[PDB]
């Protein structure tokens, strides 16, 4: 109940604001990939090679079974901490594998 305290809808009634009027931000643009970025990173990737743990995860991904996927995750989780960062690294590695097929 919007006009009331305690409803599933926050109590108070406010005149909403326009899309034009809203706060201008920059800092909210954080995770952007500028093509410059992307390219540079790919360059150095080729210049670099994969890291041993990255390789392990890679083999596991190439196979593709449930066990293999699990191990990929486990390793990412274990070397990096943060089940999340694991998920992210899985993404990156897959991208390179997939793009390597072509």
């Amino acid at each position: 109940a919007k006009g009331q305290a305690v409803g599933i809808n926050k109590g108070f009634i406010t005149t909403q604001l326009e899309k034009k009027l809203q706060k201008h931000s920059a800092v909210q643009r954080k995770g952007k990939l500028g093509k410059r970025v992307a390219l540079v990173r790919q360059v150095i990737r080729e210049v670099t090679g994969f890291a041993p743990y990255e390789k392990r995860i890679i083999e596991l991904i190439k196979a593709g079974s449930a066990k293999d996927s699990k191990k990929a995750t486990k390793i990412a989780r274990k070397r990096l901490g943060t089940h999340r960062r694991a998920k992210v690294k899985k993404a990156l590695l897959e991208e390179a594998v997939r793009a390597q097929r072509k």
Partner: protein
């Protein structure tokens, strides 16, 4: 440890001898502050003492009902005023870049404030030349020589008198307030389990 009196709460347990604070400076200090303020006026003479402050609601549920002086104006507000942060600053206006407007009314108050400010303003350019933005006011204003306080010139009134209507009583009487607040609190309470039920009966 003898009688019925309330369990003591130790104070001087550590070595406080090193840690005592004395208030005699206070006397002179007040005075110093005075002269400082005064010497500010004299050195600032044509201009006002306190720079322009927008206003907002306070940060707590209990404080919402009240009004408080903000540190700065929202860029959104300077926009609707038509001032650049830089300019507003050359004017004596106080700007705050991390504050954001989530309400029309909060824009309104500060617009009203800004405009009020500008209207009452006098601007001294390099002698006898005139200018455009926020503009610049006539040489004769140099003679006008205003020493003014911001609360006098750019204030904010509210009176509590709540208007009465009967037709509405006839209306309002047909609902039940308690029942309302209850079913609402309830809804917030069980929302999660309920949505989960929707999701589960859907799959």
């Amino acid at each position: 440890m003898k009688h019925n009196n309330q369990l003591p709460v130790a104070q001087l347990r550590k070595h406080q001898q090193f840690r005592i604070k004395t208030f005699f400076n206070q006397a002179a200090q007040k005075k110093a502050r005075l002269h400082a303020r005064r010497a500010q006026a004299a050195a600032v003479f044509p201009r006002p003492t306190e720079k322009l402050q927008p206003v907002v609601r306070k940060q707590t549920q209990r404080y919402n009902k009240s009004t408080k002086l903000g540190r700065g104006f929202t860029l959104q507000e300077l926009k609707a005023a038509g001032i650049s942060a830089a300019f507003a600053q050359s004017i004596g206006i106080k700007v705050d870049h991390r504050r954001k407007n989530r309400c029309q009314e909060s824009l309104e108050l500060n617009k009203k404030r800004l405009l009020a400010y500008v209207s009452k303003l006098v601007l001294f350019p390099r002698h006898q030349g005139k200018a455009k933005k926020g503009l610049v006011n006539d040489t004769a204003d140099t003679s006008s020589a205003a020493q003014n306080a911001l609360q006098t010139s750019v204030p904010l009134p509210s009176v509590s008198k709540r208007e009465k209507a009967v037709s509405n009583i006839a209306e309002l009487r047909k609902k039940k307030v308690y029942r309302i607040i209850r079913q609402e609190k309830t809804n917030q309470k069980w929302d999660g389990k309920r949505k989960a039920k929707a999701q589960a009966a859907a799959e």
